[PDB]
Every structure is written in C-alpha cells, then in structure tokens.
Amino acid sequence: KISLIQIFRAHLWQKIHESIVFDICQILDGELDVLQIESVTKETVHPRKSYKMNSSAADITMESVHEWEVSKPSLLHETNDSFKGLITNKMWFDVQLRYGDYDSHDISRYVRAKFLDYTTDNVSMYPSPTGVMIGIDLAYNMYDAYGNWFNGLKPLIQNSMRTIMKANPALYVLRERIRKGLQIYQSSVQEPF
Amino acid sequence: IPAPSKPVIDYELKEITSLPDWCQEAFPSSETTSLNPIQSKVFHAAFEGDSNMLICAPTGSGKTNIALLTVLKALSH
Amino acid sequence: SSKNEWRKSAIANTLLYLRLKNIYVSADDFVEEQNVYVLPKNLLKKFIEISDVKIQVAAFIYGMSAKDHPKVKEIKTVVLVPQLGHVGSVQISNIPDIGDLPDTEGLELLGWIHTQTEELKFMAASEVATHSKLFADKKRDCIDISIFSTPGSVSLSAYNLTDEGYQWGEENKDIMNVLSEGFEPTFSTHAQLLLSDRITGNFIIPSGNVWNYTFMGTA
Amino acid sequence: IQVAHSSRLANLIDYKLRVLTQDGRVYIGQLMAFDKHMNLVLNECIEERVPKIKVEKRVLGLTILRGEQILSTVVEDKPL
Amino acid sequence: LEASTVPWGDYLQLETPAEVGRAIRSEKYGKQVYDLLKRFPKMSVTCNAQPITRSVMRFNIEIIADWIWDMNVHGSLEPFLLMLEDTDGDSILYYDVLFITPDIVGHEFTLSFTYELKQHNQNNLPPNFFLTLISENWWHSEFEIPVSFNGFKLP
Amino acid sequence: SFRPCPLSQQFCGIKERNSLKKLKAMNDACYEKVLESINEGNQIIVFVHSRKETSRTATWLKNKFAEENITHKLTKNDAGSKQILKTEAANVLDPSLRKLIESGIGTHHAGLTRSDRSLSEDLFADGLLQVLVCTATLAWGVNLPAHTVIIKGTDVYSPEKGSWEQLSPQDVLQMLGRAGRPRYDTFGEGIIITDQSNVQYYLSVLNQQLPIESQFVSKLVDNLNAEVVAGNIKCRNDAVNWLAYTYLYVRMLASPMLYKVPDISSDGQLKKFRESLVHSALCILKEQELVLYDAENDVIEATDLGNIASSFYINHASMDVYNRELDEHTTQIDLFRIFSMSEEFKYVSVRYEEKRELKQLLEKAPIPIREDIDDPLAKVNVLLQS
RNA sequence: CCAGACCGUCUCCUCAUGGUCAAUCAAGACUAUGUAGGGAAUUUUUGGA
C-alpha cells in the first residue's frame, strides 16, 4: 500500500490520464481533415472521472465534417472490419486506466467488458452512442482499445498507442517511480565517469 | 554617518512684511514670518535681477516658494 | 476543438496574398467553338484574401460579351452574396437582383466562383447540387470556377455542366454520397478560363455588408 | 457652516434651510417639496421677528410656504 | 441592439418612431431613439467623375448631410476624411479631410478635386473607383460609394 | 547642510555571497533596523527593487514581529482607531494586501489600485501606518516624508540593458530625500541595505560626487528631426549651431574623451565633432525617410513621415518599425502586433501574477494572437483589446 | 497625439409634438424634441414702496 502511495503521489494517476488525453487530442489535430474531422472536443471532466471505476464518461468527443459510417464494436487489433453498419456525426473516446494484476491483467477483455457496460449503462454520460474505449493498463504497461471504427481511424489509433507508450511523459514518470520503488536500473556503465 | 552640519549664519532671515502690498498674500499661512536659510540669499536676487537663474538645493526646502516669488516678480512688470 | 479550429484558420488568413505569387493551370487546348472566359488578376486576388484556408467561400460572377469577340466573356462584376460555409461545402442564397445599381446595363449572369482544398478534375456532390439549386430553370449554360488553394500557389479549375447534372441536383440535395459516386467525373466538362492584367473588375456586396453568415446562424 | 457646491433646487432637497420674507422676518426649516413658484414646504417653521437690534423666536408652524413674499433661501446645516 | 443580430444601417433607415420602438424590443424610448438616429450622421452622397484631359481626372462630388446638429453630442464641427481609393481597395489615389460645419448640414454641398493617373491605368481603365467618407468620431458612418467608369473613354 | 531635516546616512554592508543566504541576511538586517526604530515611535519606509518583492517582504515582516511582540505596532486601545481601520480596510483592497494593512505594515506600488494606493498614501498621513514597504514610485512622485527610510538591495533590472545594474545615483538620492518630516520631526534616518563590495562606490554617490552627465546621444536624432520639421535647420551648419546651445555640447567641452570624441586640438569648439554627429543623425534619418540630405552639397528638408513623428512624439526606432512592419496587405490581426511592437512598449514585460488573467483572456479574445502568453507583445495586444 | 474662435460645451416651468402605459362611455403620469411661450396684466417671477 505504502509503495503504491509513493508511486502515485501528486495525483499521479489523474495526471497520467489527462496527459494521455492531451496526447490523443494533439494526434487528432495533426490529422483532422484526413479522417473527415471538424472538431475534437476535450470534455471538461470532474477530476475524479479517471479514478471512478464504478461509472465512466467520454474524455475526447469528436465531430464530423460530414458523416462517419462506423463499424460494429470491435478490438483495436483487427484486419476484418466493415464500415457499413451504423452512421454518426458525433463520436467519443474514453481513456480507461487500471492497475492490472495477474488474474485481471488481461486488458483487451477488460476494455471489451467496460465498453459493453458503459454504453448500455445510463450513468455514463456519453454524448453519442458510438465511441471507443481506449484502455491503458498502468500496472502492466499494456493498452488495448475497444469500440466503433470508421475508415483510416484504427491504424492511426494504433500508431498513437505505439508512440504514446514510448513517449507519454506521465507514463514515463510512472515507470520511473516504479523503478525507484523496485531499485531495478538500466546498466549504463559500471565504472564511475 | 552623523547628521550633516547646521548652516553658518552670514545673512538676515528675510520676513514677509518687507514685501510690497500685493505680495503679502504669497505666504497666507505665514507660520515663521521669516524665509528658510536658502531663500534669504535668493529673495533679493529673485526681486532684483531679470536674468537666468539656477537653484541647486535640498529635496523639499522651499522650491515652491521660490517659484512663487519668481512668478510674482514676473507679474510685477 | 470548436474554438481551436477557427482561431488557427484566422491566423493563417494573413498568408493568403502569398498564394498568388505562383499561379498555374493544366493548360487545356484553346477552342473558339465554345465561349471562353477572361478573368482578371485583381478580383481573384481579392477573393482569395476574403476566403478561408479550410472553409468554402463562394460568390456569384457577372459580366458581358465585348465587341471584339462576342464569344469572349469578360468578367467585370463579381457579386459576393449571403452564405454559410463549412469544410468542403457551403449554403448559398438566390440569384442576386442587381438592376437597381448603376453600371448594370444588361450584365448577364455568367455564373459563380468558389474555393476548396482538394485537386479534382470534376465538381463534387456538395458543389454540383448547389449549382443545380442555383440555376435549375434559370440558365443551363452557366460556368463554375473552382479555385484550388494551398500555401504557395492557387489553381483555377473552371467547369461547365450538362442537362443531366441539374436533374441529379434536383433529386439528390441532402446527404447522397453513393449517388455522387455514381455520377463521379461525368458531367463536369473543363470550360475555358484565362487570367489577365489587361482588364480589371469590381465587387457587389449585400446591404448589411456581412456576406459570411458563419456564426450568424439565425439571420 | 457646511454646504457644498450644489447646482440646483432638485439636488438640495431635504436640507435645513433658512428662508427670508419681504418684511424681514427670518425663518428656518427643512425643504421638503419643490414647485414652480418655490412654494417650499418647510418641515418645521421657527419664525423670527426683528422690530423696526435683536432677533426674537416663534414655533407655531410646520408649513407650506408661499412664493410671492420670499426673498432668498439660505442653507443652515445638513441632516443625518 | 447588440443582441438582436441586425445591420446597423437598417435602424438608421427606419423612419417612424413607433416602428423604431417596435424593432428595439422596447416600445418605451423608441421616440428618443428616433430623435438620436436623426442626430447620427447620415450622408446621401453622390459623385460624378469627369476627365479634363488624358492624364488628369476631375471628380465632382455631391455631399449632402441629412443629420440634425447638437453642440453637446457632435461638438464644434464634424471632420469627415474623404478617401478616393481604387476598385479593389488596395491603394489610395487621393485623400482629404473636410470639415462639415453646422451651416452645411442639409445643403447640396459640392466638393471638387483632381487626380493624375498612372501609365497602365491611363492605358486600360477600371469599372469604378471608390470614394469613401468616414467620420473621425462617429462609428459605422463610413459611407462609401462607386465612382463610375463605364465607357469613360479618354481623349 | 542647508536641509530642513539633516539626513543621517547609514549602510548595512552585507558580506554574504549566495542569494538564498544573502536575502535572509538582508531581511534580518531590515528587521533589526525596524526593531530599533519602532521602539522610538518611528514611522518607517522600506524601498525594494520590484513589485512582487514588496508583498513578500511585508509577509515576512508580519511573520517575524508576531513571534516576539505584536503589541508595539498596534499599541493604542483602539475604540475609534479600530473603527477607522474597519472603515478603511475591506472596501476595495483586492490584491491579498488587505491582511498586511490590517497587521499594520502595508505597502504601495505600481500594481496597487488607484483608490487602494490613495488609501495607503493617506493611511500614513492620517496617522496610523507604522511600516511601509515600497517600490521606487513614492520617491519619484509623492512628497510624504517618513522619518526612517531603508533601501533594500542594489541590483535593479533595467530593460534598457537587459541586465541587473546597481541602483543609479539619481534615484538613490531621490529616495533618500524623503526622510524626517521638515514640518514636524527634527532629523532623518537614511539606511541602505546593500552588498559590501559596492558600498565603496555608493559612499561617493551619497556625498553627491557623480555629476549630471548628459544622455543626449540616444534622444538627439528625434529632436533633430523635430527641429527640421519645425523649419529652421536647412544645413548641417545650422544643426551644429542649434546643438551649441544644448547641454551635451557643454558636457563635451568640459570632458570630451569619454563621449566618443577624438581630440581637442583639431576640433577646438567641436567644429568637427558636431558636424560628424549631424552627419550620423542624417544618414539614419534619411534611411527612415524622415529628412532629405546630401553629403557634399548639404541641403536639409522635412518629409511627411518626419512631420508625423514630430507631431505625435514618436521615437525614431518606433517610426522605423512602423515603416517596414506596415504593408499594403496588412490586416486587422497584424495592426495589433505592429502597435505592440511600438518601442514605447520595450520596457513592458509579462509577470507571474498577471499570468492567470492573461490565460483567461487569450482563450476568449476576439482579435487573435500570432504570438503567445510568454511574449510581452501579445500581452500588450490583449490589454489593448480589453 | 488628433477639432477651438468668423461659432449659443448648460437649464428651471406650462402648453403642443408624436410613442408608451396605468386606465373608462373620450380623461392622467413618463422619457425626448426647442419647432411654442413665460407684463394669460387680478392666484405668485415683473410692483404697494
């Protein structure tokens, strides 16, 4: 418990979540027109929303230039999709952090579950009915995302995830903290400089 | 550092009743009825000569009064 | 990001005079058989300046045939009109009643002009439909000027329209992406346009002096 | 005596005013109302006589004054 | 006024006080507004250009002033900066500050000036220049008009 | 010696080097001084470098005296005094400086409300405020003396250089001027809290040794332009003649070698130096199309730009900036930027306590900003908009 | 910074002028316009000292 507290001091979790959201937004900005995107709105969420595991809501809502013809609910990694299922002008995303642990460290499954739930549950104030739940596992450093998809989106998302995990600064901070707690280090050179 | 020296007196502290008729309301609240150490040398000068003048004096020590005097002199003509 | 998108665009809009330093078109064969348009370098520049980097700005264009060649069309009068623009589309008002003003001794409806950011050799659904709406039973042989715009250079892609497009427009106003697909390149015949500095032209604008109704949604 | 740089009759309403009449009898009273002829309603009228040397006093009225015989209204001291 | 989303000049154009009152979302003060709208500058401007020779161009301006004066609000006089500018509104051809005094406001006041042209301009000439009267004090006066050049063939 | 209240000069002379200890030491010294004073019934002013510094200093003071003795600053029973305080405490005192005022060791600086500042000024004059932490506004402006005057620090930041300079003699003297009240009190306590190394320099300054040295080299050109516009400098000879009457010339005559002068033998009465100066002026002016000039023939005349500059008292640099940055195709957004760039806003800078407000603004700003929050130009533009 | 000397930066009261309201079978309170008047001879400001 103590160790965890040390790791996640200075509202670390929240910071991580927000950081991820920001990154996502930036990515979207970088490629708006290519996916027919008018506006990528950041929700002004309650500080708690990130460490509420009971409820949920959107983080990054999304608006079409014209219209998006989104697919069925599905996993981030999938070659076989069809964009002839449902339609929307408005999409959303949800970054879900969770501290995985050996039994319940499967992230993909978790994402699938929560997406299924928080769509159907009334308390999750999603603007639209079609969105995605990007799920990051802090405690194993594993992402996976589940939900609806429009053409060219999924690859972009994947790319972001790849970059995010490499780069995202709050996650790096978290990693560092973990390392400190453990006193694992990377070699560098043994002799003193 | 100690307090600077008090001035050597080789002059008359010029009074308000020495002025003409109109200039006696230049000092309406005539508290001392005698000008400060600086103006005693500048008063006659102010009155006498219509020339270009310069007062290198301490901060807050009758500059306003001097100005007033000058104005009065100017008006005299 | 409804707040970020507009501000950025506005900022960009300073660098719109720079898009006419280089000007070039895919030079089509010059043919006297059909009527040919002679556009000036100042009006176009002005239009560019007015316009947005993302959103489609689109005015009407007017003029008349000179006595050197009746086949030649000289664009003297641009007619900027009430409009609400989006990214790759625009909502536009009726044909302008402009008999009241001076210097309008029978100025014929030559057509309309618009901006975009996708290099096509044809008119898209949001455009073609609009065109149809504008000139359904009013004038069949009017032309369009689609100006492709990007940082560095603009490009004047002029187009004409056949009788089949009008019908399509009439039937297929809102949505209609598969019908657009079906239509595709046909029918947008590349009409003849020139850019000159030997003639110049002027702007008509509405009485309110607020042609762009982007954020005036109710008015 | 305290009375400010007041502009008009409207800005000086509800003030203790001395009032002077034609024959020379001096009044005091708070100015309540305004009118065309300056029929100024005094809140409490203490009339005073000077014979044709020294000023006397009275206290009969809390009056509606009439304009015809008034000379000039002087302010005495503000209320509150 | 701010919240109704209307062009300003429309209000100026409106004639009847009742109508004005109706249009403000406030039947009270309508009359007052009307009174103050006639106390806002309103110029029924006209301008006839005419070439003296090939290079020089005369410009006979007819500047009428429909507004009613007030020494409190307007002040001493009304400076109105006249700009003759090209068809585009890119460069200024000629400019002049003119004082509209209390004696002028209402009379058919003419104003004349001259302008020498460029070489290219002289050769091939535009559809119309833009003469522009703007108030240095009053907001949204900025009355601008087309100085016609339709078939103006030089000698 | 002819002063009404004779000025008792005093130096602290800090030996410390590192800024975290040094500052602490300075604070301690100040406290000591204050303690020495207030026991005698001495109303006291503490000058500092910067605006943000003052409040912090006040806070520090508050935290120090309360440990030892709160009573000596609020000594009176306060039946009427308390009422007075109440009346003149919580009216419009916004900056979180009200607490300081309440305590009785307040402050006045550029960045305190006009009303608030006035109140502060009068909360000394009415006869209540003991300690007064201050920036260098009070000395320049207001006559109100205050027996004890401490000057905290040497290093002021001037945007002129872009570097932390020592306190300039002309300001220090002014500061010292306000002291023991000529009307009421007998004499004045003048203290300089400073670094020991620079005291040797400061002592001389205090004795009124460093004279009035001319800084006409920067403001020459504009003046010249103005003169030209007015219509009496038709040649460089005329310009030279004009310059003859100015103080700069006199200064040069007195001591030439420091002010860019070559030699006394060839020039004599600066009959070459002046000419050279004029030439220098008239190249730059010409470049900014302010005046007409030829090198060999020598003929002067005023341009329109020059005239404009003269009229509106625009600095030459500003004019130059305007010249290039204004263009044929310059739009609404650019105008603001241009305005911001005006050289009269070179001494303007964004600050931390300003920053939240700025942030709030620049989201909902109507006229957009090409520059960003850290830049002063942007800030200026937003202020203009406001 | 920029307009100002050939030039009324400023009104206490009644009536009319049009727009409103508060209202009863044809009448009052408020902004505004000066385009009206102020020896309506006696109820006032133009004569009983």
C14 reaches F (C-beta below 8 A): yes
DSSP letter at C141?
T
User: Distances from the Cα of F69 to the Cαs of F63, F128, F219, in angstroms?
Assistant: 11, 18, 53
Do residues F47 and F125 both lie within one domain?
A: yes
User: Distances from the Cα of F305 to the Cαs of A30, C56, F312, in angstroms?
Assistant: 46, 41, 11
Report the chain C residue with the minimal C-alpha distance to residue F331. C14
Does E150 sit within 8 Å of C105, measured CB to CB?
Answer: yes
φ, ψ dihedrals at E21, nearest 5°: -60, -45
- Confirm if F102 and F85 have CB atoms less than 8 A apart: yes
CATH code: domain of residue F21: 3.40.50.300
Size of chain A in residues: 193
Going by C-beta distance under 8 Å and a sequence separation of 6 or more, which residues neighbour residue A22? A42
- Confirm if A89 and A64 have CB atoms less than 8 A apart: yes
SS3 E144: strand
User: Distances from the Cα of F127 to the Cαs of F104, F106, F121, in angstroms?
Assistant: 12, 13, 11
- Confirm if F15 and B51 have CB atoms less than 8 A apart: no
Q: Where are the alpha helices (DSSP H) in F231-315?
A: 236-245, 247-254, 264-267, 273-287, 304-312
User: Distances from the Cα of F364 to the Cαs of A44, C41, E89, F351, F360, in angstroms?
Assistant: 16, 37, 31, 20, 7
C13 reaches F (C-beta below 8 A): yes
B71: tokens are 């104005």
Backbone φ/ψ region at C93: left (φ over 0), alpha (ψ -120 to 50), beta: beta
CA distance F372 to F379: 8
Q: State the amino acid at position B40 in one-letter form.
A: S
Within a 10 A sphere around the Cβ of F127, how many other Cβ atoms? 9
* Strand G-contacting residues in E 27-46, CB cut-off 7 angstroms: 27-32, 35
End-to-end CA distance of chain F: 51
- Confirm if A151 and A83 have CB atoms less than 8 A apart: yes
> CA-based diameter of chain A, in Å?
62
Q: Which domain holds residue F105?
A: 4-212
Chain position carrying tokens 């400060």: B36
Do residues F112 and F170 both lie within one domain?
A: yes
CA distance E80 to E143: 10
Do residues F198 and F228 both lie within one domain?
A: no
Q: State the amino acid at position B16 in one-letter form.
A: I
CA distance B19 to B23: 6
Q: Which residues pair with F107 in a beta bridge?
A: F133
Q: Which residues pair with D42 in a beta bridge?
A: D31
CA distance F310 to F302: 10
CA distance F246 to F251: 9
Does F177 sit within 8 Å of B60, measured CB to CB?
Answer: yes
Do residues F135 and F185 both lie within one domain?
A: yes
CA distance A120 to F261: 87
Strand nucleotide closest to residue D68 (CA to C1'): G44
Q: State the amino acid at position D19 in one-letter form.
A: V
Whether CB of D36 is under 7 Å from strand G: the answer is yes
End-to-end CA distance of chain E: 52
Whether CB of E3 is under 7 Å from strand G: the answer is no
Residues of chain C with Cβ-Cβ distance to E124 below 8 Å are: 198-200
Backbone φ/ψ region at F23: left (φ over 0), alpha (ψ -120 to 50), beta: alpha
Do residues F49 and F129 both lie within one domain?
A: yes
Do residues F164 and F274 both lie within one domain?
A: no
CA distance C184 to C178: 10
**Domains recognised in chain E with CATH numbers:** 1-39 (1.10.150.20), 40-155 (2.60.40.150)
Residues of chain E with Cβ-Cβ distance to C38 below 8 Å are: none
Q: Is B61 annotated as a binding residue?
A: yes
SS3 F70: coil
Closest CA relative to residue A58, chosen from A76, A44, A73: A44
DSSP letter at D41?
B
C11 reaches F (C-beta below 8 A): yes
- Confirm if E131 and E148 have CB atoms less than 8 A apart: no
Do residues F284 and F249 both lie within one domain?
A: yes
Does C207 sit within 8 Å of E5, measured CB to CB?
Answer: no
Residues of chain B with Cβ-Cβ distance to F143 below 8 Å are: 60
**Parallel, antiparallel, or unpaired for β C192-196 and C36-40?**
parallel
F257: tokens are 């070698």
Do residues F29 and F137 both lie within one domain?
A: yes
Task: Estimate in Å the CA E58 to C1' G6 gap, whole number.
Answer: 31
What are the b/e assignments for A81-120, b being 16+ CB within 10 Å? bebeeeebebbbbbbbbbebeeeeebbbebbbebbeebbe
Q: State the amino acid at position B64 in one-letter form.
A: T
What are the b/e assignments for D42-52, b being 16+ CB within 10 Å? bbebebeeeee
The answer to whether the Cα torsion of F275, F277, F281, F284 is positive or negative is positive
CA distance B56 to D37: 64
SS3 F144: coil
What are the E-state strand segments in F135-213? 148-152, 156-158, 163-165, 188-193
Closest CA relative to residue F243, chosen from F222, F265, F220: F220
Does C202 sit within 8 Å of E87, measured CB to CB?
Answer: yes
- Give residues 39 to 68 of B whose Cβ lies within 8 Å of F: 57-61
CA distance C115 to F3: 79
CA distance A93 to F77: 66
Q: Nearest-CA residue to the C1' of G14?
A: D36
SS3 E109: strand
CATH code: domain of residue F287: 1.10.10.10
- Confirm if C59 and C165 have CB atoms less than 8 A apart: no
- Confirm if F139 and F156 have CB atoms less than 8 A apart: no
Whether CB of E68 is under 7 Å from strand G: the answer is yes
Of F145, F177, F187, nearest to B3 by CB-CB distance is F187
**Parallel, antiparallel, or unpaired for β F163-165 and F156-158?**
antiparallel
SS3 F20: helix
Does A67 sit within 8 Å of C1, measured CB to CB?
Answer: no
* Residue C69 Cα, gap to closest chain E Cα (Å): 17
CA distance F346 to F333: 20
CA distance F306 to C36: 52
Chain position carrying tokens 């400019």: E95
CA distance C45 to C171: 35
Residues of chain F with Cβ-Cβ distance to B7 below 8 Å are: 1-2
Within a 10 A sphere around the Cβ of C82, how many other Cβ atoms? 18
CA distance E65 to E44: 7
Does F370 sit within 8 Å of C10, measured CB to CB?
Answer: no
The answer to whether the Cα torsion of F28, F29, F33, F34 is positive or negative is negative
Do residues F160 and F96 both lie within one domain?
A: yes
Chain position carrying tokens 């026991």: F39
Q: Which residues pair with E46 in a beta bridge?
A: E62
Going by C-beta distance under 8 Å and a sequence separation of 6 or more, which residues neighbour residue F319? F288, F290, F305, F308, F309
Q: State the amino acid at position C44 in one-letter form.
A: L
Q: State the amino acid at position F271 in one-letter form.
A: K
CA distance A186 to A184: 7
CA distance F369 to C55: 20
Burial, E113: exposed, middle or buried (Cβ in 10 Å; 0-12, 13-18, 19+)? middle
- Confirm if F302 and F319 have CB atoms less than 8 A apart: no
H or E element, residue A26: helix A12-30
A23: tokens are 């990154």
Chain position carrying tokens 């920053």: F355
Sheet architecture: strand order including E109-116: E46-51, E56-63, E109-116
Whether CB of E89 is under 7 Å from strand G: the answer is no
Does A29 sit within 8 Å of C2, measured CB to CB?
Answer: no
- Tally of CA atoms within 13 A in the half-sphere of C1 that contains its CB: 20
CA distance B40 to E133: 64
Q: Which residues pair with C116 in a beta bridge?
A: C148
Do residues F126 and F249 both lie within one domain?
A: no
Long-range contacts of F318-326 (CB under 8 A, 24+ apart): F318/F342, F318/F343, F318/F344, F319/F288, F319/F290, F320/F288, F323/F288, F323/F289
SS3 A150: coil
